[PDB]
Amino acid sequence: GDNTKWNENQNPRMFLAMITYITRNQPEWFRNVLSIAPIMFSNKMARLGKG
Amino acid sequence: EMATKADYTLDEESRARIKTRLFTIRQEMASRGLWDSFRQSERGEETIEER
Numbered sequence: 207g208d209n210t211k212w213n214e215n216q217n218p219r220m221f222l223a224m225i226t227y228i229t230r231n232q233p234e235w236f237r238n239v240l241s242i243a244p245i246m247f248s249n250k251m252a253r254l255g256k257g
Numbered sequence: 258e259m260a261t262k263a264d265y266t267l268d269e270e271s272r273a274r275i276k277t278r279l280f281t282i283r284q285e286m287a288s289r290g291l292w293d294s295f296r297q298s299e300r301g302e303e304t305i306e307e308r
């Protein structure tokens with residue numbers, strides 16, 4: 207089996223949910239520093255290129 | 258003060274200078290009412306908290 211459009215359907219919000227469940231009962235600084243990447247990817251911009 | 262085998266490597270006048278600087282600093286502290294918490298801040302400052 208292959209999965210189709212894998213990267214285009216992987217949502218950063220679900221990565222944030224996964225990281226939040228994985229880092230339960232951890233120090234809060236650790237959860238924050240692990241949560242920043244899904245947040246930044248949820249608000250990301252794609253540069254269009256050369257034109 | 259204390260020292261291993263009571264061998265204060267320095268002499269009386271230099272240790273007196275050190276003690277005079279410490280006393281001056283502590284009284285400068287108590288002038289601004291800062292000494293109490295600083296005195297009670299020793300049992301935790303060998304533990305580095307991440308923020």
Ligand SMILES: [Mg+2]
Binds near residue numbers: 207208209
């Ligand atoms: Mg395959």
Ligand SMILES: [Mg+2]
Binds near residue numbers: 208
């Ligand atoms: Mg393929």
